[PDB]
Design a protein around this ligand. Structure first.
Ligand SMILES: NS(=O)(=O)c1cc(Cl)cc(Cl)c1
Lengths: 111, 115, 111, 115
């Protein structure tokens, strides 16, 4: 139900081994929910299941700064954060992020 | 200024007017402290948020209230807000323009950093 | 060897049934090379084969204006045109385009 | 203004200076006629391309020479150029800002259209 895809606009490639953390807003604060690293294809699958991914407000933090640091390029952002309300009925969500050192774009494909 | 925010609407091809913007700075105890806030003008710009003296080195968060913007135009957007988080003035004072381009299910943000 | 993917930033969906034309620069002008329409997944595959897709300068024209017109939204651009030199050795190219009425982004994933 | 072009570099977070820009207008016989050209200033802006009288209704093409820009910085970029093609002044005179954000394998272009 939730997929994250990250691309690198400097090299024209998937952004591989980018750490991604997902959080859910608690009744009070952000509670950790899921995490992983992007694959060779810049994709992270399997973050959650249909049963666990209930309506709520979620945050996806993509660790863009470590990615750029590993390539030797000075970035602007600490990370890219995408915050969205889910399921306002169940859908598949692809959160896609296109990364440059001083700029990022994020889009949601909801199907 | 040292810090300007510019917001554009990619559906209308126009500046995004009356968009709330909240700026926070990370404290010594790792909390986010309110730093400044404002709303974008008829030109999509928000000037005047801070001064060179108050805008010290730190990690800053700029949160643009894109959801209220879309909802007032009748759109239910995907994102709650657009948030940009960055280290400022680490190599000395700079001037920063934070630009965001908004669509209902996408946004882009760019920084222009000058001397 | 060449894939085109198109997304709709207004609806957060694949951009379906978008006409795509591909051209190669001739020794003189743009010569038509391939075309098709994006699928339900916003993808267009099968434009060309490894043997036909030689080094050269190619143009991909995506008919964004008809897409927006079909949805009842007034667009700015006539089309989105991506022009690139290929194979400067053989690679798989994904040309991705994210569409809004007054803005588009295009990226190349070369693998 | 009636026509301005702005170009930013997403690798450096800075305006894209000395970028060649060529503007064409589609003729009655369906050819592209040269209309105006210029290069971006130290602020990434190109002003002065045309006047209200000469900028009639038509289909215009703005071609930004992004490849020469990247190559002068030592980068072999994906795109030959960024080209924006649009109908202008169909509902009366407007002012157009064509903004492009450049990376080596990506670019975005946006239009701000005002009265
Ligand atoms: N960031 S993007 O719109 O260019 C994009 C989105 C998806 Cl889901 C796939 C690809 Cl290959 C590219």
């Amino acid at each position: 139900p939730l997929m994250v895809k990250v691309l690198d606009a400097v090299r024209g490639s998937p952004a591989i081994n980018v750490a991604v953390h997902v959080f859910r807003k608690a009744a009070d604060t952000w509670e950790p929910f899921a995490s992983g690293k992007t694959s060779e294809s810049g994709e992270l699958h399997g973050l959650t299941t249909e049963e666990e991914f209930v309506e709520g407000i979620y945050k996806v933090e993509i660790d863009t700064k470590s990615y750029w640091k590993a390539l030797g390029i000075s970035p602007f952002h600490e990370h890219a954060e995408v915050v969205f309300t889910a399921n306002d009925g169940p859908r598949r969500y692809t959160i896609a992020a296109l990364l440059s050192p001083y700029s990022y774009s994020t889009t949601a494909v909801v199907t």
